[PDB]
Amino acid sequence: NLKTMEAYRVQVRSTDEMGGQIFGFPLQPGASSVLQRTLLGEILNYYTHWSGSLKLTFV
Amino acid sequence: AQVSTQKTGAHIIHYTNINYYKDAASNSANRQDFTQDPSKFTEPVKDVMIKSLPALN
Amino acid sequence: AQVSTQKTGAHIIHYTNINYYKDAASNSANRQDFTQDPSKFTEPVKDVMIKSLPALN
Amino acid sequence: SDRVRSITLGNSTITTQECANVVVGYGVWPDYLSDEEATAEDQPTQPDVATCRFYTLNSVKWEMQSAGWWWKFPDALSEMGLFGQNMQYHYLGRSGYTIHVQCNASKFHQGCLLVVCVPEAEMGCTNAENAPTYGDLCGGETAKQFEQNAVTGETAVQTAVCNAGMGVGVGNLTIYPHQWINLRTNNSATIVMPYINSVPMDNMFRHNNFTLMIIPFAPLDYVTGASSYIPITVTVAPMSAEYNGLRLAGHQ
Amino acid sequence: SDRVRSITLGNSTITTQECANVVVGYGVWPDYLSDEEATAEDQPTQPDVATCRFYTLNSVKWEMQSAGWWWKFPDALSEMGLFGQNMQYHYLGRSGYTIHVQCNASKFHQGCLLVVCVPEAEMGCTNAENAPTYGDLCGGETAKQFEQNAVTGETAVQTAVCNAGMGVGVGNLTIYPHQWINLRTNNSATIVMPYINSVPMDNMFRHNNFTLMIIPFAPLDYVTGASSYIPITVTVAPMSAEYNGLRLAGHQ
Amino acid sequence: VDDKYTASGFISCWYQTNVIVPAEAQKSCYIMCFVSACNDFSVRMLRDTQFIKQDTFYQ
Amino acid sequence: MGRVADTIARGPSNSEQIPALTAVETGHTSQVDPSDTMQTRHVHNYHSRSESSIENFLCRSACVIYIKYSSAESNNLKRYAEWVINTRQVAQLRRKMEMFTYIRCDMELTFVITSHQEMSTATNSDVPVQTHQIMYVPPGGPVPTSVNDYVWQTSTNPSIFWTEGNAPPRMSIPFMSIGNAYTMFYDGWSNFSRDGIYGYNSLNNMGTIYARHVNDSSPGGLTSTIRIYFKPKHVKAYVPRPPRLCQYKKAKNVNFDVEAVTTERASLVTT
Amino acid sequence: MGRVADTIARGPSNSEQIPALTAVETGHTSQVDPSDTMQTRHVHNYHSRSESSIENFLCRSACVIYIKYSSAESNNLKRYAEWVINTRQVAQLRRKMEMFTYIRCDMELTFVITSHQEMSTATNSDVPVQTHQIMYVPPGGPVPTSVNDYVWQTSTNPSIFWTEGNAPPRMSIPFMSIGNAYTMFYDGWSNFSRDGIYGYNSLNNMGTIYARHVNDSSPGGLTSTIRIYFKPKHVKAYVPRPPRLCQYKKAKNVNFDVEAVTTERASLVTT
């Protein structure tokens, strides 16, 4: 999915049980595979310290 | 001479700077300007959106 | 410039110090602070013990 | 008199009739974290009288060949009460203490102990290529005990008093808060430790704030026909405990 | 609009976008016991944000032949969180609630539920010489479910809706605090119960303050090809919990 | 950088209920995630990024 | 000064205000604090955003090329340098300036010049200390074609003479551009026919830096090397851009090879 | 300022005050003056406790390691340094900082870099003066793997360039730690399982200092050596500890070998 557009979206779907866990990843921006090539990961990889709350907005 | 505050760390602290050259491109770099304005990459919208209200009425 | 007293020996005596850098971690070391407080390794007890009285009444 | 004290914390109380003062470690009485020294941005639970109260650790027999004992904190209160149930549901915690060692003996017994609270006591290892396994530092409520002579194991803690299991002279443990239980004067020692660490709160399980040590400096001795078992009981009460950063059970 | 609410208790939050108000049971909002109505002479622990917060009970499938469900409280929170660890160390407790039943469905589904909080619901028994065994009243986080027709067991609870398992007309459960989840309007119901008992605090394990009941009054019905599983999830958050009279673990 | 001392926790996402959708619409949807820092966020101490490399000058 | 926002306490809420819900169907990103999704406490917060300015970000020196030249022509090194100024040779300094579309700044060029003796058959070799000349020819000037010619008279060209063993020589170059800012990405063409060179290389035209050994050649000969270092100052950078994801190919183009967005994971759910 | 207490005169006494008796069954040590056990005289005493501060005690430079590196690889010296920062290599500087549990301070790193020629078969050897680079990589940065690679571009890393014959280069390093003080003894483990590294080495993570010869290798080659020196400044040291009695074994552990408390005496009574 790395060279397609499928990278950026996770399929959620109707289930006939309850459905498990859609996704989960260790938080740690700029060193987590998920978060390190975004704009809070290529602007943290010019630094070696970070602090404060971040926020994830789902759609 | 211009006397300005140093970078101080949180919980004297002055330094003196004299410019010796006739060009203002020879002055030492600014590093004491910490001005910001996030709200034009962060909130570029025409009509103000209030946080506590729903975005789309 | 800050003008401060030198270490003088018992029975002029000033020196001038100007800080040239913008960080306060570039300043020369303190060595003129001789403050103490022995009574917290030496007398850490909750209730004061008076020297002239017996310790255990 | 000045030989009588009472300490009431929570619903527990402990009283003494031969006592030498209270040693407040470093002259700071424990109290809650301020808002100028905070660093964690969520409401701390403060159970108050549900965790601050005397807990009693297992008693150890003071033999005439005993070389001492130590209990690392707060790993000796990990199983005690509701204090131990709020280290398993929180990532952070801080709490002072008021260790009270007690050990009565007759007026025909003699012996001397050094009760000392050592912040950040980092223990050696018998093998110099290894760092000691967890079970050899901590016993929980049961003290791990010093040995008179140098021991050889592999992952065993180097226990010889004369080095105090830290490689420092054992007579020099005195800058650390301490009192002496000498059996011809007092019979109890009370050391009120504050929270001493370089960060405002720290994970209870992972890190051990201090280590109590009780080291006989004059052996127990008595003329036979007298009592031959005198125990040393250590009680300790958390003071101003607060925990923060709630998460699931465990410490995996 | 008036269809949107948010409730934040502790570190939990629950939000709705189809909602009909909040029903405050008997017009009393839960709050701590006063000093004029107290009766226990020791300091109550009040954990606050460590026990007041939404807990989620197991979801139940709403079939087209379902006859209802019930959960007795506070025996459904006996295993939940730190609420359930402060019923096992205290002889007393009191606490309001804010039951929030939720059950979304499409606009092509139809069905109606009655969500009702019944204080002191005392259940019948199939045999009239017996009083029902514990396992047949409570399932913990798992609901016990009503049956459409009269059942015959021995120690089994008499479950027939038309009597509501109490011998009272099922349509008359409406003086009790209630809302209806009707799938063409709202999709959530919020009932804030206060503490209702005849004594100021009472032992959590022994006595059940109230019993939630969810009873279909119009069956779930849909044209096939649509979703065939719609769950009903019940969350409930303690409000102003306080416990008193600390003692050892258990409930033996 | 990833350091075990100063781990930053985990993000996870679960089905609270289910995706329920009528007959004549798709049973698969998608969730996308965005990430941004809050207004209390800060960094310190520069280092060069390790996401770019070269063997020789480009010419 | 600049400091982070404080966290402000709030109690539980159960109101018809939804801070948490938002619509990202607009450019407006959510402005929620962590004081809007859980209770929090008052934290007076002293952190400073003082190293994340654009005059602390860009204001550290970085190498931009080395040129080698020789006093005997070691192996195709000529006897003088030559190098048409651009910032595109490296992938370090380049990447940080291709994170903004336009930048105006006043450089400081610092040169670090070192030498080493060649392999040679010369014996009894003793050389006096070298003096190196670094000449800057603004575009359209005359260009040297040999170690000694009239162009190195530096009749009006800026030039630095420096003798080895002294501190690295530096100077400041004011903001010099036709534009009101340097352009880091140009989408146009040189011609009006949409022909010829395309991209930012059309606008690039910053002159050429030459250098040579002032000293006449000794018998053994040497090979010197000069490393140019640019440090921005007084920087105002306009219009931000996503930083590069791909390795560069060329210094006149943005051509790239298609590359992965991110490193692998085993699955959606990983601890 | 700080000065010693004066001795105050007293005459003979024969009272019911006992200063001399005390009970050391408490942490309270006796506070007796020599004016309480014999008569004494008034002595105005001018001695100062001015060299026993913690900013005179710790505030002298001390060596903390030397690293050797070569321009031709003399004998397993590579062509660059590398050394993960800690204070535990030596027994001098280390001992004085293991006499306190926590210290916050601002170092001054001074490097003293010297070189000597190798034994080699090269003849007619003349080398220009060496230039040495000392780069500091804060933890988690990219690490060099050869004498020349992209990591030594020092795009944001602090770096010092220095040419032999000049005064030793120095700089100040501010107080940089996660904590509110450096930790000299940690009783915890890295993991929450009480597994992995134990002791102070868990918290230690201060980056790595590399160094190399800037100059391309000459035929004879050299071996340079760099000695790092730390001098604390602005020191506040909290919680004292008994100084070490035992020789150290390792730089990541406190392991020790059991040793004598004190040197011998013949008997209890010795003149």
JSON list of N, CA, C and O in Angstrom, two decimals, chain E residues 78-98:
[
{"chain": "E", "resi": 78, "resn": "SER", "atom": "N", "xyz": [-19.76, -4.51, 39.74]},
{"chain": "E", "resi": 78, "resn": "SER", "atom": "CA", "xyz": [-18.98, -5.14, 40.77]},
{"chain": "E", "resi": 78, "resn": "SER", "atom": "C", "xyz": [-17.63, -5.57, 40.25]},
{"chain": "E", "resi": 78, "resn": "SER", "atom": "O", "xyz": [-16.72, -5.79, 41.04]},
{"chain": "E", "resi": 79, "resn": "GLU", "atom": "N", "xyz": [-17.50, -5.69, 38.92]},
{"chain": "E", "resi": 79, "resn": "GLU", "atom": "CA", "xyz": [-16.29, -6.13, 38.28]},
{"chain": "E", "resi": 79, "resn": "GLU", "atom": "C", "xyz": [-15.70, -5.01, 37.48]},
{"chain": "E", "resi": 79, "resn": "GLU", "atom": "O", "xyz": [-14.60, -5.14, 36.95]},
{"chain": "E", "resi": 80, "resn": "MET", "atom": "N", "xyz": [-16.40, -3.85, 37.38]},
{"chain": "E", "resi": 80, "resn": "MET", "atom": "CA", "xyz": [-15.96, -2.77, 36.55]},
{"chain": "E", "resi": 80, "resn": "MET", "atom": "C", "xyz": [-15.05, -1.89, 37.35]},
{"chain": "E", "resi": 80, "resn": "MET", "atom": "O", "xyz": [-15.42, -1.45, 38.44]},
{"chain": "E", "resi": 81, "resn": "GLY", "atom": "N", "xyz": [-13.87, -1.59, 36.78]},
{"chain": "E", "resi": 81, "resn": "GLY", "atom": "CA", "xyz": [-12.95, -0.56, 37.20]},
{"chain": "E", "resi": 81, "resn": "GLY", "atom": "C", "xyz": [-12.63, -0.52, 38.65]},
{"chain": "E", "resi": 81, "resn": "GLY", "atom": "O", "xyz": [-12.53, -1.55, 39.30]},
{"chain": "E", "resi": 82, "resn": "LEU", "atom": "N", "xyz": [-12.45, 0.71, 39.18]},
{"chain": "E", "resi": 82, "resn": "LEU", "atom": "CA", "xyz": [-12.03, 0.96, 40.53]},
{"chain": "E", "resi": 82, "resn": "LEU", "atom": "C", "xyz": [-13.25, 1.23, 41.35]},
{"chain": "E", "resi": 82, "resn": "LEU", "atom": "O", "xyz": [-13.18, 1.33, 42.57]},
{"chain": "E", "resi": 83, "resn": "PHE", "atom": "N", "xyz": [-14.44, 1.32, 40.71]},
{"chain": "E", "resi": 83, "resn": "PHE", "atom": "CA", "xyz": [-15.72, 1.35, 41.38]},
{"chain": "E", "resi": 83, "resn": "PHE", "atom": "C", "xyz": [-15.93, 0.04, 42.09]},
{"chain": "E", "resi": 83, "resn": "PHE", "atom": "O", "xyz": [-16.38, 0.02, 43.23]},
{"chain": "E", "resi": 84, "resn": "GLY", "atom": "N", "xyz": [-15.57, -1.07, 41.42]},
{"chain": "E", "resi": 84, "resn": "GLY", "atom": "CA", "xyz": [-15.78, -2.41, 41.86]},
{"chain": "E", "resi": 84, "resn": "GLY", "atom": "C", "xyz": [-14.76, -2.84, 42.86]},
{"chain": "E", "resi": 84, "resn": "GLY", "atom": "O", "xyz": [-14.93, -3.86, 43.51]},
{"chain": "E", "resi": 85, "resn": "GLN", "atom": "N", "xyz": [-13.67, -2.06, 43.01]},
{"chain": "E", "resi": 85, "resn": "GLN", "atom": "CA", "xyz": [-12.63, -2.34, 43.97]},
{"chain": "E", "resi": 85, "resn": "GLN", "atom": "C", "xyz": [-12.84, -1.51, 45.19]},
{"chain": "E", "resi": 85, "resn": "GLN", "atom": "O", "xyz": [-12.05, -1.60, 46.12]},
{"chain": "E", "resi": 86, "resn": "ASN", "atom": "N", "xyz": [-13.90, -0.68, 45.24]},
{"chain": "E", "resi": 86, "resn": "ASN", "atom": "CA", "xyz": [-14.21, 0.09, 46.42]},
{"chain": "E", "resi": 86, "resn": "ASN", "atom": "C", "xyz": [-15.55, -0.34, 46.91]},
{"chain": "E", "resi": 86, "resn": "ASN", "atom": "O", "xyz": [-16.11, 0.31, 47.79]},
{"chain": "E", "resi": 87, "resn": "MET", "atom": "N", "xyz": [-16.10, -1.47, 46.42]},
{"chain": "E", "resi": 87, "resn": "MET", "atom": "CA", "xyz": [-17.25, -2.06, 47.04]},
{"chain": "E", "resi": 87, "resn": "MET", "atom": "C", "xyz": [-16.77, -3.23, 47.83]},
{"chain": "E", "resi": 87, "resn": "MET", "atom": "O", "xyz": [-17.52, -3.76, 48.64]},
{"chain": "E", "resi": 88, "resn": "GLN", "atom": "N", "xyz": [-15.51, -3.65, 47.61]},
{"chain": "E", "resi": 88, "resn": "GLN", "atom": "CA", "xyz": [-14.99, -4.85, 48.21]},
{"chain": "E", "resi": 88, "resn": "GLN", "atom": "C", "xyz": [-14.13, -4.50, 49.36]},
{"chain": "E", "resi": 88, "resn": "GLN", "atom": "O", "xyz": [-13.58, -5.39, 50.01]},
{"chain": "E", "resi": 89, "resn": "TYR", "atom": "N", "xyz": [-13.98, -3.20, 49.66]},
{"chain": "E", "resi": 89, "resn": "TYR", "atom": "CA", "xyz": [-13.15, -2.76, 50.75]},
{"chain": "E", "resi": 89, "resn": "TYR", "atom": "C", "xyz": [-13.95, -1.81, 51.57]},
{"chain": "E", "resi": 89, "resn": "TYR", "atom": "O", "xyz": [-13.38, -1.05, 52.34]},
{"chain": "E", "resi": 90, "resn": "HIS", "atom": "N", "xyz": [-15.29, -1.80, 51.45]},
{"chain": "E", "resi": 90, "resn": "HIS", "atom": "CA", "xyz": [-16.09, -0.88, 52.21]},
{"chain": "E", "resi": 90, "resn": "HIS", "atom": "C", "xyz": [-17.39, -1.53, 52.52]},
{"chain": "E", "resi": 90, "resn": "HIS", "atom": "O", "xyz": [-17.94, -2.27, 51.71]},
{"chain": "E", "resi": 91, "resn": "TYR", "atom": "N", "xyz": [-17.89, -1.25, 53.73]},
{"chain": "E", "resi": 91, "resn": "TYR", "atom": "CA", "xyz": [-19.12, -1.78, 54.24]},
{"chain": "E", "resi": 91, "resn": "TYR", "atom": "C", "xyz": [-20.27, -0.95, 53.75]},
{"chain": "E", "resi": 91, "resn": "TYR", "atom": "O", "xyz": [-21.41, -1.40, 53.78]},
{"chain": "E", "resi": 92, "resn": "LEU", "atom": "N", "xyz": [-20.03, 0.29, 53.28]},
{"chain": "E", "resi": 92, "resn": "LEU", "atom": "CA", "xyz": [-21.09, 1.19, 52.94]},
{"chain": "E", "resi": 92, "resn": "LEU", "atom": "C", "xyz": [-20.72, 1.82, 51.65]},
{"chain": "E", "resi": 92, "resn": "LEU", "atom": "O", "xyz": [-19.58, 1.73, 51.20]},
{"chain": "E", "resi": 93, "resn": "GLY", "atom": "N", "xyz": [-21.71, 2.45, 51.01]},
{"chain": "E", "resi": 93, "resn": "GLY", "atom": "CA", "xyz": [-21.47, 3.17, 49.81]},
{"chain": "E", "resi": 93, "resn": "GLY", "atom": "C", "xyz": [-22.78, 3.75, 49.42]},
{"chain": "E", "resi": 93, "resn": "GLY", "atom": "O", "xyz": [-23.83, 3.27, 49.82]},
{"chain": "E", "resi": 94, "resn": "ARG", "atom": "N", "xyz": [-22.74, 4.81, 48.60]},
{"chain": "E", "resi": 94, "resn": "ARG", "atom": "CA", "xyz": [-23.91, 5.40, 48.04]},
{"chain": "E", "resi": 94, "resn": "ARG", "atom": "C", "xyz": [-23.35, 6.01, 46.81]},
{"chain": "E", "resi": 94, "resn": "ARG", "atom": "O", "xyz": [-22.15, 6.24, 46.73]},
{"chain": "E", "resi": 95, "resn": "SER", "atom": "N", "xyz": [-24.20, 6.28, 45.81]},
{"chain": "E", "resi": 95, "resn": "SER", "atom": "CA", "xyz": [-23.74, 6.77, 44.54]},
{"chain": "E", "resi": 95, "resn": "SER", "atom": "C", "xyz": [-24.97, 6.84, 43.71]},
{"chain": "E", "resi": 95, "resn": "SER", "atom": "O", "xyz": [-25.73, 5.87, 43.64]},
{"chain": "E", "resi": 96, "resn": "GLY", "atom": "N", "xyz": [-25.19, 7.99, 43.04]},
{"chain": "E", "resi": 96, "resn": "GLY", "atom": "CA", "xyz": [-26.13, 8.14, 41.95]},
{"chain": "E", "resi": 96, "resn": "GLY", "atom": "C", "xyz": [-25.56, 7.51, 40.72]},
{"chain": "E", "resi": 96, "resn": "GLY", "atom": "O", "xyz": [-24.54, 6.84, 40.76]},
{"chain": "E", "resi": 97, "resn": "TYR", "atom": "N", "xyz": [-26.22, 7.71, 39.56]},
{"chain": "E", "resi": 97, "resn": "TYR", "atom": "CA", "xyz": [-25.85, 7.07, 38.33]},
{"chain": "E", "resi": 97, "resn": "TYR", "atom": "C", "xyz": [-26.27, 7.99, 37.24]},
{"chain": "E", "resi": 97, "resn": "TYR", "atom": "O", "xyz": [-26.90, 9.01, 37.48]},
{"chain": "E", "resi": 98, "resn": "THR", "atom": "N", "xyz": [-25.90, 7.64, 35.99]},
{"chain": "E", "resi": 98, "resn": "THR", "atom": "CA", "xyz": [-26.38, 8.32, 34.83]},
{"chain": "E", "resi": 98, "resn": "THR", "atom": "C", "xyz": [-26.31, 7.31, 33.74]},
{"chain": "E", "resi": 98, "resn": "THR", "atom": "O", "xyz": [-25.46, 7.34, 32.86]}
]
